[PDB]
Design an enzyme around this catalytic site. Sequence first.
Site, PDB file in Angstrom:
ATOM      1  N   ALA B  99      -4.688   9.439   4.154  1.00  0.00           N
ATOM      2  CA  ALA B  99      -3.574  10.329   4.478  1.00  0.00           C
ATOM      3  C   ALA B  99      -3.057  11.139   3.289  1.00  0.00           C
ATOM      4  O   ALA B  99      -2.184  11.998   3.484  1.00  0.00           O
ATOM      5  CB  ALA B  99      -2.414   9.527   5.077  1.00  0.00           C
ATOM      6  N   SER B 140       3.759   0.207   4.235  1.00  0.00           N
ATOM      7  CA  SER B 140       4.675   0.853   3.296  1.00  0.00           C
ATOM      8  C   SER B 140       5.411   1.993   4.002  1.00  0.00           C
ATOM      9  O   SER B 140       4.896   2.582   4.960  1.00  0.00           O
ATOM     10  CB  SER B 140       3.925   1.394   2.060  1.00  0.00           C
ATOM     11  OG  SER B 140       2.994   2.438   2.396  1.00  0.00           O
ATOM     12  N   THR B 145      -0.561   6.754   5.281  1.00  0.00           N
ATOM     13  CA  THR B 145      -0.996   5.896   6.376  1.00  0.00           C
ATOM     14  C   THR B 145       0.125   4.957   6.803  1.00  0.00           C
ATOM     15  O   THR B 145       0.561   4.969   7.961  1.00  0.00           O
ATOM     16  CB  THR B 145      -2.226   5.098   5.944  1.00  0.00           C
ATOM     17  OG1 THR B 145      -3.223   5.998   5.437  1.00  0.00           O
ATOM     18  CG2 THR B 145      -2.799   4.302   7.122  1.00  0.00           C
ATOM     19  N   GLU B 183       7.404  10.115  -1.464  1.00  0.00           N
ATOM     20  CA  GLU B 183       7.682   8.923  -0.660  1.00  0.00           C
ATOM     21  C   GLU B 183       9.033   8.989   0.047  1.00  0.00           C
ATOM     22  O   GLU B 183       9.127   8.505   1.191  1.00  0.00           O
ATOM     23  CB  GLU B 183       7.578   7.673  -1.540  1.00  0.00           C
ATOM     24  CG  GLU B 183       6.229   7.640  -2.219  1.00  0.00           C
ATOM     25  CD  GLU B 183       5.859   6.283  -2.728  1.00  0.00           C
ATOM     26  OE1 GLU B 183       6.321   5.282  -2.138  1.00  0.00           O
ATOM     27  OE2 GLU B 183       5.108   6.213  -3.726  1.00  0.00           O
ATOM     28  N   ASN B 206      10.399  -2.636  -3.317  1.00  0.00           N
ATOM     29  CA  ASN B 206       9.506  -2.987  -4.421  1.00  0.00           C
ATOM     30  C   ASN B 206      10.260  -3.100  -5.743  1.00  0.00           C
ATOM     31  O   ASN B 206       9.838  -3.847  -6.633  1.00  0.00           O
ATOM     32  CB  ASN B 206       8.378  -1.957  -4.553  1.00  0.00           C
ATOM     33  CG  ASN B 206       7.076  -2.394  -3.870  1.00  0.00           C
ATOM     34  OD1 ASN B 206       6.916  -3.555  -3.480  1.00  0.00           O
ATOM     35  ND2 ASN B 206       6.125  -1.448  -3.738  1.00  0.00           N
ATOM     36  N   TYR B 224       0.489  -5.574  -8.072  1.00  0.00           N
ATOM     37  CA  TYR B 224       0.600  -5.785  -6.634  1.00  0.00           C
ATOM     38  C   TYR B 224       0.298  -7.234  -6.273  1.00  0.00           C
ATOM     39  O   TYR B 224       0.918  -7.795  -5.352  1.00  0.00           O
ATOM     40  CB  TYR B 224      -0.331  -4.840  -5.876  1.00  0.00           C
ATOM     41  CG  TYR B 224       0.111  -3.389  -5.835  1.00  0.00           C
ATOM     42  CD1 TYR B 224       1.445  -3.024  -5.586  1.00  0.00           C
ATOM     43  CD2 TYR B 224      -0.820  -2.379  -6.038  1.00  0.00           C
ATOM     44  CE1 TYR B 224       1.827  -1.668  -5.539  1.00  0.00           C
ATOM     45  CE2 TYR B 224      -0.464  -1.044  -6.000  1.00  0.00           C
ATOM     46  CZ  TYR B 224       0.849  -0.681  -5.751  1.00  0.00           C
ATOM     47  OH  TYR B 224       1.130   0.674  -5.734  1.00  0.00           O
ATOM     48  N   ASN B 228       2.782  -9.363  -4.140  1.00  0.00           N
ATOM     49  CA  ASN B 228       2.431  -9.719  -2.773  1.00  0.00           C
ATOM     50  C   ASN B 228       2.488 -11.220  -2.542  1.00  0.00           C
ATOM     51  O   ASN B 228       2.867 -11.660  -1.454  1.00  0.00           O
ATOM     52  CB  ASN B 228       1.056  -9.163  -2.437  1.00  0.00           C
ATOM     53  CG  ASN B 228       1.079  -7.671  -2.307  1.00  0.00           C
ATOM     54  OD1 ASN B 228       2.150  -7.080  -2.182  1.00  0.00           O
ATOM     55  ND2 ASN B 228      -0.086  -7.048  -2.312  1.00  0.00           N
ATOM     56  N   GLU B 254      13.880 -14.006  19.896  1.00  0.00           N
ATOM     57  CA  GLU B 254      15.019 -14.702  19.311  1.00  0.00           C
ATOM     58  C   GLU B 254      15.470 -14.056  17.998  1.00  0.00           C
ATOM     59  O   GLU B 254      16.653 -14.161  17.641  1.00  0.00           O
ATOM     60  CB  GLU B 254      14.645 -16.175  19.131  1.00  0.00           C
ATOM     61  CG  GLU B 254      15.767 -17.109  18.755  1.00  0.00           C
ATOM     62  CD  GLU B 254      15.373 -18.576  18.936  1.00  0.00           C
ATOM     63  OE1 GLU B 254      14.435 -18.837  19.736  1.00  0.00           O
ATOM     64  OE2 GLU B 254      15.994 -19.449  18.272  1.00  0.00           O
TER      65      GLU B 254
HETATM   66  N1  LIG Z   1       4.637  -4.823  -2.341  1.00  0.00           N
HETATM   67  C1  LIG Z   1       3.545  -4.069  -2.268  1.00  0.00           C
HETATM   68  N2  LIG Z   1       3.665  -2.700  -2.137  1.00  0.00           N
HETATM   69  C2  LIG Z   1       2.559  -1.921  -2.062  1.00  0.00           C
HETATM   70  C3  LIG Z   1       1.295  -2.490  -2.115  1.00  0.00           C
HETATM   71  N3  LIG Z   1       0.387  -1.494  -2.018  1.00  0.00           N
HETATM   72  C4  LIG Z   1       1.043  -0.317  -1.905  1.00  0.00           C
HETATM   73  N4  LIG Z   1       2.391  -0.564  -1.936  1.00  0.00           N
HETATM   74  C5  LIG Z   1       3.469   0.434  -1.833  1.00  0.00           C
HETATM   75  O1  LIG Z   1       3.107   1.424  -0.890  1.00  0.00           O
HETATM   76  C6  LIG Z   1       3.485   2.708  -1.341  1.00  0.00           C
HETATM   77  C7  LIG Z   1       2.466   3.743  -0.877  1.00  0.00           C
HETATM   78  O2  LIG Z   1       1.969   3.383   0.392  1.00  0.00           O
HETATM   79  P1  LIG Z   1       0.483   2.785   0.560  1.00  0.00           P
HETATM   80  O3  LIG Z   1       0.486   1.671   1.578  1.00  0.00           O
HETATM   81  O4  LIG Z   1      -0.045   2.296  -0.769  1.00  0.00           O
HETATM   82  O5  LIG Z   1      -0.397   4.028   1.087  1.00  0.00           O
HETATM   83  P2  LIG Z   1      -1.338   3.890   2.388  1.00  0.00           P
HETATM   84  O6  LIG Z   1      -0.689   2.977   3.400  1.00  0.00           O
HETATM   85  O7  LIG Z   1      -2.714   3.395   2.013  1.00  0.00           O
HETATM   86  O8  LIG Z   1      -1.400   5.380   2.997  1.00  0.00           O
HETATM   87  P3  LIG Z   1      -2.288   6.514   2.276  1.00  0.00           P
HETATM   88  O9  LIG Z   1      -1.371   7.618   1.809  1.00  0.00           O
HETATM   89  O10 LIG Z   1      -3.295   7.069   3.254  1.00  0.00           O
HETATM   90  O11 LIG Z   1      -3.010   5.917   1.091  1.00  0.00           O
HETATM   91  C8  LIG Z   1       3.567   2.624  -2.855  1.00  0.00           C
HETATM   92  O12 LIG Z   1       4.716   3.290  -3.324  1.00  0.00           O
HETATM   93  C9  LIG Z   1       3.660   1.144  -3.166  1.00  0.00           C
HETATM   94  O13 LIG Z   1       4.921   0.834  -3.713  1.00  0.00           O
HETATM   95  C10 LIG Z   1       1.165  -3.866  -2.247  1.00  0.00           C
HETATM   96  O14 LIG Z   1       0.050  -4.381  -2.295  1.00  0.00           O
HETATM   97  N5  LIG Z   1       2.296  -4.654  -2.323  1.00  0.00           N
END
Ligand SMILES: Nc1nc2c(ncn2[C@@H]2O[C@H](COP(=O)(O)OP(=O)(O)OP(=O)(O)O)[C@@H](O)[C@H]2O)c(=O)[nH]1
Lengths: 326, 437, 427, 54
Positions: B99, B140, B145, B183, B206, B224, B228, B254
Amino acid sequence: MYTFVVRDENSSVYAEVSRLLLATGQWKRLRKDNPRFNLMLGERNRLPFGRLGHEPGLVQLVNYYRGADKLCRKASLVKLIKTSPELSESCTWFPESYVIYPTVFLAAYNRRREGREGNVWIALISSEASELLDFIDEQGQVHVIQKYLEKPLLLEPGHRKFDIRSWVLVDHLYNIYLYREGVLRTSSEPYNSANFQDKTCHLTNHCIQKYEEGNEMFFEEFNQYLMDALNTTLENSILLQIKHIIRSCLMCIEPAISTKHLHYQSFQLFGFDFMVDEELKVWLIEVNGAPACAQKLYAELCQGIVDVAISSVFPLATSIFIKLHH
Amino acid sequence: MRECISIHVGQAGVQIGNACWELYCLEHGIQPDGQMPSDKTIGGGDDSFNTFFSETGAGKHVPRAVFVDLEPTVIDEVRTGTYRQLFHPEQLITGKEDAANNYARGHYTIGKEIIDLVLDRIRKLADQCTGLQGFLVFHSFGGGTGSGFTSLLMERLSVDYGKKSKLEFSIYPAPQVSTAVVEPYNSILTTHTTLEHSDCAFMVDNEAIYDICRRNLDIERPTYTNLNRLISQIVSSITASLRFDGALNVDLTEFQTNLVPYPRIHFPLATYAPVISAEKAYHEQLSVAEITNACFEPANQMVKCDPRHGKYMACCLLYRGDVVPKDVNAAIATIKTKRSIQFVDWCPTGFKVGINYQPPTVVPGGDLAKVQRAVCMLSNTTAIAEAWARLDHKFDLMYAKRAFVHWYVGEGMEEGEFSEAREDMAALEKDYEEVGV
Amino acid sequence: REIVHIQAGQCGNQIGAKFWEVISDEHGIDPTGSYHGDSDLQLERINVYYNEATGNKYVPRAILVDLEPGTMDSVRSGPFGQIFRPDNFVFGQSGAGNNWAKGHYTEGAELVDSVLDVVRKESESCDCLQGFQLTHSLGGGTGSGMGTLLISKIREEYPDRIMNTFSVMPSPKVSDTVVEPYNATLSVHQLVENTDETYCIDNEALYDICFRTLKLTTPTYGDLNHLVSATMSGVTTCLRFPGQLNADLRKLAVNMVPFPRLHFFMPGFAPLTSRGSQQYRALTVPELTQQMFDSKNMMAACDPRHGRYLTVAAIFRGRMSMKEVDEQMLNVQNKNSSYFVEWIPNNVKTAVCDIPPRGLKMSATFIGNSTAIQELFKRISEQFTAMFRRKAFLHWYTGEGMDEMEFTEAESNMNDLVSEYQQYQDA
Amino acid sequence: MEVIELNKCTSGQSFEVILKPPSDPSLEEIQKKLEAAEERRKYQEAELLKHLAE
Ligand SMILES: Nc1nc2c(ncn2[C@@H]2O[C@H](COP(=O)(O)OP(=O)(O)OP(=O)(O)O)[C@@H](O)[C@H]2O)c(=O)[nH]1
Ligand SMILES: Nc1ncnc2c1ncn2[C@@H]1O[C@H](COP(=O)(O)OP(=O)(O)CP(=O)(O)O)[C@@H](O)[C@H]1O
Ligand SMILES: Cc1ccc(-c2[nH]nc3c2[C@@H](c2ccccc2)N(c2ccc(O)cc2)C3=O)cc1
Ligand SMILES: Nc1nc2c(ncn2[C@@H]2O[C@H](COP(=O)(O)OP(=O)(O)O)[C@@H](O)[C@H]2O)c(=O)[nH]1
Ligand SMILES: [Ca+2]
Ligand SMILES: [Mg+2]
Ligand SMILES: [Mg+2]
């Protein structure tokens, strides 16, 4: 080089604090909307406490305590004194008060019909309940009504009323620092308890007064008067009680406003307004959360804010405060 | 028994899902091949762990999970990782082109090409469910995505499973580990399109997880993986009642009943204690009173904010370990006096308590020390609106110049969806503010 | 995520060849195409830029274009000249005479279709094509005129792929002909419309860096191209190696370009090293951070203190503390936050990659989208109008069928771009 | 401080403590919205191709 923003242009105290900061060569002022500040000298209303302490790499500090309005609102101070066990229903230092809205006060005023004792109250002053209750409904907002102190201490020569403003600074560690310079704000008009509607000798506010310069008598003179006229000192007769009231109020709200384990930090300057009756008893009138200072004392006090509240957190390259020990 | 299906979307969602399912397997004694020597009902059962695991005739315990990413990098590590045995290939859905941190690219352009396939894979697990409860969706706010495909999935799930509950675990964007300058845009867009489709959402900022790792785990620059494993501990506290015998939060319904009296305001604050570094040799074990008191320290919350300046609508305590009711009520007694805990007038001042005797499970070799008792507090407080205010302020800053808007319009979104999503957020902040003053 | 590289004209093929030398050494590929490296970070993302051939050889996904055979026989003789796929040398014989019209309309048009044939054969062997990177100068005729013709045609065939360029701006300090300002203005007009990302590489800055900082009294294109290949290596680090980020050309455009026309980046590099002579004290993280933001390390001769940063990318290379890098990056922002627009929150993003470039233990590459870049376009605009108000040298272009009007349009588009940058520096 | 609804079992127990009493869109709509967005992309792209043809 620390950074600060200014969001209350109407502030005489922090107009000074910012000029002092800039002139240390180690502080730079930013635009009000720049979020990379160390210090927020914030606005009075709707200060954005929820946007503070989320700047990675920035210790952030602000000159207000979130939640401190519950002390600095006529109606809120009443509810806080009547409902906190720390401050019993009987404080012995707060005047009897009730929050009547305008769309149990009568239970007490009737009690005064039993002994025909004093029955002057305030918002504004009157003697019969109806005269005043019609006034809170003519204004439309919440007023608080309170027992007027019919026998105030009067300064001679003059037979004059007065109130005492104490400036209290509370730092990020919740140290309570009482500025040692108080001011008496006196009525040039000789007090008399017959005509209240002539509230020039009753309302002792500097503006309302539009023997001593500026209707202001500092602690040097007043302690000398107490010695000569009453054989006591300012410390013994009045200041003990003031320090007790300041400490009690601020210790009460401390769990609700403390920023000790919080991601941003607060300090705040308060102005406490007192009233000494004829037996040398001290009463608390109001707590002002955004107070101004007397002209002679702006230099000393604004410098002391920098020393104690600001530089304490952001250090650079005997004292004017009494620490109230809790 | 009533089954739950976990859906993990985008990088953050998939990686957090892996942390969680790793943890679930250690907690239920399921090995990386899915064999569970403890299940004596082979190839079947209506045990409460079967809520999350189906079984093969060969006795393999398979997560009721679908992973979906618009690019293959991340789900490909699952496909070759230590728990590759666990999942059926049909559960791992991948695109070719992601995305690009663009909500409208995940929702409109790319989303439209894969939404039928994903819902077809989701339907395959639903058909193995005797009485499906609903979905737990991990994602996220920040990714293209995570934000954009999830909001399209949440709309269709409402259409297809009108009667099923949907819970969210949402990663709120923090600049210290952020991927994109836009974001805030994606966060607001996905909230606005998802709000009426989600019954309950646990937001993890985060920033908060990151600072717990630095303070309490002594990790200089958390990865991460650090984030996580801690997040998955919290998720595990929250889902333990669906996977274990008990009487509190026993079905997804519930969670709404207990934590969300007003439906838009469905974002409970999670607070977790204790977080103990595994390198800390001498650790004095914390008491029921101490870990419960720590539930009211902002430094332990999933979102930094100040509950003293809001009101509660509901509050659950979830303990794991050596905890008995009497210590909890004694701890609650003295915390009621010492703390600012204001409930809204139209709600009782009280706590629903859940105790599970199995103490927290920690990944061997991870960062968390084993502890004798832990608690996760779930509290619906209006102070979580602080996070909405932060996001909305950042959105207003960029959008007033329309910075980056052309990237979204170029994917077929209209400028007006921005101010629509923002106006919904404006109403959300106003709802919280009515309830909380 | 394959990238297709194109290099066009004399400058484009000279800096093109250095780029493939530098990154080939980084990925451990030798001049015959065989990998002889130690780490596996070297091969994880090798396919972004290299196609794999039978015999497990690695062949750059690179198309070499010129209207003259001269420089390209030089590439084919050069050290790594044999690594390039020979079918990918597409060249004519007439040259372009430092004339944008010849490259774009007459000579170049004769050759462009056979270049597009090679581009097509490269694309069709791509699992997921990100897009294209073009190296070229704006001051001659081939890379300028034909290079922008290629871009216009590539965008017609692949409208949804990213178009990225490294564009060398002309300067009187390193000047081949008086008509460079004409060719550059015509080219900037094309770049503004048809690229997503262009690294502005100012021969004025490369010269000043060589003269003042590197103490080279007589810089050559060799001295300039050393700086160019170190920058090109730095800015593509995120594409070529794995990070916490899965970095590609579109995510870069999404986070760097808040308005479509403002996509001209100021590159910077640290430490500034002259070719040959190495120095033996690695920089400290504080030093990298300070130099890479120093105007003296910028490859576009623009003063960043005269504009504001819309966005910034920073890529640190080597074994270092990510805690200290985060600290120093947060320090430079919070200390000079007035130079960052307040209406794009958190507009600075930083990456670290373990593998340093050859011969340095610590380096930092800077990519800025600063409103100060308008200084570069103002400069070229003033030189353009000095000649154009007297129609000087136009006959070289009207002789190829061009009209004065088309010069008036290009100049006026470039002045709008200047005004658009000034809009946001005051915002 | 009132304790209620104590449920016990071998895994743990749960209960509630009172400290104080009180004082959607359809598939076809989704499909329009998505297909409207794809048409707007096609308009924008045909405009680009018209311009490149000029
Ligand atoms: N806590 C935590 N946050 C994450 C992790 N991976 C990504 N994020 C958060 O997700 C945000 C961006 O969304 P992503 O989920 O990485 O992106 P995506 O869902 O793959 O969507 P795309 O844009 O297509 O890549 C970032 O700002 C990170 O802070 C993770 O493994 N753990
Ligand atoms: N219970 C009481 N008995 C006697 N005098 C009283 C009183 N309460 C107030 N007063 C006097 O009457 C005045 C009424 O003014 P009020 O207290 O409303 O002003 P303030 O203190 O809010 C003004 P500022 O904010 O500038 O200090 C007081 O300032 C005090 O001098
Ligand atoms: C303010 C800002 C700037 C960039 C990003 C972002 N988000 N994703 C990507 C980026 C850039 C980038 C920038 C610096 C560090 C790491 C990534 N980038 C990249 C791609 C190809 C390159 O040759 C070089 C860099 C990505 O892939 C987010 C905010
Ligand atoms: N930095 C650098 N600039 C160059 C080099 N070669 C040419 N240039 C610049 O490019 C301009 C000439 O255009 P050129 O590309 O050589 O003409 P072309 O053969 O038609 O593409 C001059 O203004 C030079 O400053 C080089 O090797 N390095
Ligand atoms: Ca079973
Ligand atoms: Mg991804
Ligand atoms: Mg030349």
